Symmetry: D3
């Protein structure tokens, strides 16, 4: 997949394409409908499937620092776009172009001159041009005879509208199961493992891995979750008895640094039945189900007792998760008991 | 009007005066009674009308950093004192003088030796001297035959006591209309316009003006308000189609910087039906009515839609405000529609 | 009393001892049972009474920065241990030793090899060894014939379990009287007196003393308390009319610095009927009873009026406190009236 | 004078203009040559005189937070442009447009479509377009018979090159006299007066005005300077014996207070006043001395009085040399 | 000794006193001349000896946060005054009173109404009143037959001027020997001992005590010094083999840790102890070496052992020179 | 290769090993002598080759936050060990164990009980035990007939001593050529690429990759360097015309941005790409120039183009000298 920053970076010799346009944060099941329809139509005519997306978030342009939390990073948005068959992502920055343009010159400059589009796919909510004047209906009538438009209704399922907004609310509530249901996969983050308390190994109270994330990253509510930790492909040695590219059962503790300026979430992972320390590695943490709310501890004995209960509840939730195999990982490690 | 810092700066040759004494924060309608009575009595005898006020706030002397929010700056207190006919303001600092003095030596040093007073005007709540022992009744009996005292009852109107305390509560609640009612004018702030998001002009989502204020400044609750923006007299050029000294209709957005140490309010102004950028100018923002509470936005389209509703509601409230002309500005700009 | 940091610092020639083991934070009435039983048994056999305690808090080892607030500092834990007849305190750091050790090697290394114990005293809640596997019952059966064990039940009185946890809740609620009841003494802090607002002396509104404490220090809820201030023994001169080593009646104001990073409690003390300034001295503040919640003030007169009410209520509570003489200080100053 | 942010804000009905293009930081005597030639050629064809300038600084686009210090604020750049008779300022942001454009397309879009220029005036060092390929020469050959091009050499006077760079050097070493000579006027800063030490009054040691500035503002090296302070037009009352719109003799002390801010403290000669809350203009004339530490009040006041004598002399010279002094001023021969 | 904050706190029934006036920072040998003359003249007329001093520092009123570093804390200034027999300290704040006053009114209010002085003792450099017009001479002519004035010249010894200024220079270069000679005693700081590296015990590399100080405290230049550490009177238990009120031989390492704080780390010779929580007095005797970086543990311990040898020698000299050594001390000839 | 944190994590069933002990920061040519002798002697007795190393740095235990800068991260120390054939790394924390131990007990516990060593290899400067009493010699006499000891002298080559210390000096002055010669390879850092100025693309002035590093990471002095950039193995898409696992020619600009962080900005020659989100390895070859300030875009691009020419030359030399160049690379003769 190609990645282009700005209209100017798109090759001039690109001759035909089918195009979809949106923020696409999270690439939820609704987003997958637009991508699916785009890819299928591009196959039909032997053209390329292009996603046009936006960075920084269009909201943060008008209201700096008050933009919605990112369900995925830009890098992950690229990876997901690839995994669903996109051939090229064009990234638009509204502080550089396409903001003050009229609806008419938007279609002309972007879809024709730049992308040589024959088909375009948008959601019913889609807007464009100066002061958001251009709508889905605008696009249909501006494109009559020039190129075909397909407008897809927003996805409703089980009485819930599937959008970036609702995925954020589920995450914020700590309801990762409903978020996963809306995403069509386990919600996850990735990042380098740093030093934390003690060292991963024989002692249950020390995390197997410690990660930190900036405050523009959407994460579930503080608390403990069941999920899967995966060491990303690597040739570097691993301390202890975990192997790379295997999804390990884990109790995951999401927290907020006290106090800190720009707080600032932590993720501490207790991998079941393994003695390991993952400093240096890039690690993926997938969330499956909520286990408990955060609490304060007044003794080591009390802390470990609750730790053991988390493990027990995690074993149960993960043994269920494996049975719904469309979300569960290919290669996993889960022991029947301790 | 003269301004003196400390008793020592008052001219020795000042021969007669009528004097009023208080913090006077906000110069509300109650404060106006004391000033009115003072000015009128000074006219009668051809003497000067003097306000004795306090800076820093007397409370912050005993409880540093825990002083009440300033309804007006000291500079604005001066301007308001002038506008009501005060001839001289004497500013007292309680860390320099008049704190540990007895009630008797207070009258002697300040009213006689310093100010050569023949008349003094205070509110029923007035206290003075060491450990606040001297009261309004004290002042009457210490001044028998030496000079005339006039003690004015605190102002009650429509079942509400008018004081600095109540004005602060109204502001804190976001009830600017009741605050205005108590002040006898539109509440306002003034300050330099700085750069913010994008540039003021053709795009509705970019503010016409951005200002910041320190946390000792009383401001209405976070939210959106109707009011009037006025560019203060200036010879410097103005970007766009606003003229100086004209009060322009505006939707005003009061906010709190996230997160910041010493937060730290913002004021963003969207001037109706004008394309302009006010970087560099000193700007006055008057508040008229509350419009809505603060909210988070998840798309540009959703943001602009609410923006347009704010404008609609503002046009209505301001068209009413103009009809109560005792508060409304002399020269204003308000279009009947967009 | 000796103080040893680590097993290595304990003298090799120590031949016999009776030993008690715990965090001992606060040395509450429950803790006093263990110490009493230990001291009495050591007297019987002419051996030394040893406390084995822990620093840093064992919880902060597994959960850095999320450890319980310290009811007493380590230094005060030493002083209290001395006052109840302990001959030696051994301080253990779990990042250096005794964490990953098995229950068996724990007893062997610490109690025998290091301390040459013939008697050991623990609470029913006591745990030890890797992953907290060793319990009170473990200790009894591992020590059969090698040394005598005495396990003391946790202290319940008036329907309340007396523990560090409950003492912290009482303090956090502002219920110092119930905390005192559980500690078996007035709760107190000690520290150097620094400069604050104005100077201690003739003016009631200026504190007689200002202290600051870090955020790992347990303190009562923000508000005003009755208690006793004592200048610790010193040869340095004292400004005003307080003498060292005399417990003076005082209204105590506990607060939280606005805003600050790592906030960060203040203690401001208004000593009844004395004019003094205590800059430079080390001062002990004992708490007796809650008086009122924190409030904001809008004038000097209003502030002083409430100040005087605090004094009145304090005089009453302290006159009662003196009557329960098992908590009250030996030498005190309390005037019948102002 | 109009002020347009971006090509999109320029009036569509602009039929003819004479244009000058540059950063114009400081509006020095070199810059004044470009504007003068532009303003005069604009009168000839009855057209408007336009300045195309840039904000943020072009360097800061490539090297964030490592841009040259601003000799004047953008606000002051506008006011100086107006004072030399410019009719419109167009402000280009390089993160928005005209950056990755070709040399050929830059000319067409800016000078032709947007500005409808018949004449353009640039400095010999001018460059434009993608990777700065377009030079002083590129402009001549690309414009042909469409618009007349005038390329002015950089200014050398008394064997000294006059540019934004040399001005910044002069300020940085504390040679305000040379900066001023290069600028064509007294270097100045403008800002609101805040609270400081004590109160302005009878006491010599307390400043008449305190001001703080961000680290992006070029200021003379830390030290003491002779200058003029002016209270900007206002109806707000003034504490003490000073009126607005009169330039008053002052000893000016520039300092630093890190963790950024530079401070400017003004001791107005033979006046007792406190200027808290006013907008105040401070002009620099000559260097007086370096920064120093004081260990007693007496020592500090002794040095303060010398600063006053030296200022008195240097300002009397400034008034006689005439060509740079303020129209309305207040200065005493002695105390 | 009494301590009064402001003229208003002075007893109304004070009928007669002998007075000395000054900053008195450091209470050096020059200052001791003023106090000695004051204390003796007070005994003669059966009166109390009063020190009038100033806090905050007079310079900091005019130049906030740019005041000279304090040689001693105000607390230590009180204790030194008392030790030389002063009966009362009056502390004047210049933001409160006596600042904008005339020379004539200053004398009347302070010396007459408040203190009822019959005799006053000042240094030849003394000044007072509005804009420091009142000098050593002003005081003589204004007091006439009301109170006797004694003006003492500043102290020169061995061709060196002894003042707060010169003491601050000596400390700043790390010449504590000269500072001490000027002071009349070992320079010292006092503070609570906090946690640091490891625990004080058998290990040579871990300090016996760690202390931090604010940036307003004058300290010797970063480096290693020979000195004495004393645990201040206490009933609190001491971890290890040290008693209170005995001055122990120590190698002292002064360092900086910015973003302000200066640190003092004490390595007590031939002792294993940890002084966390105690109040501790640290006296400086001689400079040993400059600060340096270490790249291995072995290297650091090798230098540490040399610091110990050099301290041992220098302290044995201090004990024999007698006139400045502590009454009760602990020092070993060898390890 | 296994990695054990503390003696307690070492397998109980380890019957025989050959052991080397040291900080090993940088794994330079001196260190490679120890490992080589260890790995070979381990093959002889069919045993595993073990490295005992230390984290945190031993100096930082005694002197917190004043430890030497790390030549490599601990992660990179592991990977280099593995590359030279070590079978196990044992990591000792001195705050946990082996610190206050006697020389005699250190040997027994670590080498005997834990590691069951038949052979040990140390550097001539090696020390151990309480207060570093145990030396290179102590080890010989304490081990006797239990385990064979081999003590290797420190490396001198071309009259230059090769140690962690000298490497840190070379880097700090910006002489990466000498650092590399001492290291046996190109010095490198590895990290995630974050957003910076503009976007990597057609524009020369925008970096292909931006990276930040903590102040504990040794880096060459601020300036411009010739080097190679490699995108580490990944399936994640790459924006622009670069593939992973190819070392690309780059001009590398090292800078500082205080209040700590050092920055590394890479300008990849003859490529248009943006590497945001990838893991990227940056190798340093030669110094090109010192840091400088720019006052115009044209000036900056002029210097940028010179940096490219000088890099082109220096890298062509690196490729021919062969012994240190990457296996797979991309470099153009001209533009």
């Amino acid at each position: 997949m190609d990645i282009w920053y700005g209209t100017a970076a798109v090759p001039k010799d690109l001759d035909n394409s089918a195009v979809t346009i949106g923020v696409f944060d999270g690439v939820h099941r609704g987003h997958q409908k637009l991508i699916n329809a785009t890819v299928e139509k591009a196959r039909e005519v032997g053209a390329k499937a292009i996603m046009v997306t936006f960075d920084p978030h269009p909201v943060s342009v008008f209201l700096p620092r008050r933009a919605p939390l990112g369900i995925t990073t830009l890098a992950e948005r690229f990876a997901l776009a690839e995994s669903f068959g996109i051939d090229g992502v064009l990234v638009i920055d509204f502080t550089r172009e396409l903001s003050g343009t009229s609806p008419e010159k938007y279609v002309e400059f972007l879809l024709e001159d730049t992308l040589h589009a024959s088909h375009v796919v948008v959601g019913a909510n889609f807007t464009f041009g100066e002061n958001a004047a251009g709508t889905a209906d605008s696009l249909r009538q501006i494109c009559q005879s020039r190129l075909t438009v397909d407008v897809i209704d927003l996805l409703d399922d089980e009485g819930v509208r599937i959008s970036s907004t609702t995925v954020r609310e589920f995450l914020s509530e700590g309801d990762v199961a409903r978020a996963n249901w809306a995403l069509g996969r386990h919600f996850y983050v990735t990042g380098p493992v740093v030093r934390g308390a003690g060292r991963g190994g024989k002692e249950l109270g020390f995390p197997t891995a410690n990660q930190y994330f900036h405050d523009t990253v959407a994460l579930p509510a503080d608390g403990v979750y069941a999920g899967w930790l995966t060491i990303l492909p690597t040739e570097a040695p691993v301390s202890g008895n975990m192997e790379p590219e295997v999804a390990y059962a884990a109790a995951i503790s999401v927290g907020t640094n006290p106090t800190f300026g720009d707080e600032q979430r932590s993720v501490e992972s207790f991998v079941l039945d393994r003695d390991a320390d993952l400093y240096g590695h890039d690690v993926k943490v997938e969330f499956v189900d909520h286990v408990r709310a955060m609490e304060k501890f007044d003794s080591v004995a009390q802390l470990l007792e609750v730790m053991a209960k988390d493990v027990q509840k995690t074993r149960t939730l993960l043994a269920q998760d494996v049975q719904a195999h469309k979300m569960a990982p290919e290669t996993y490690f889960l022991q029947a008991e301790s």
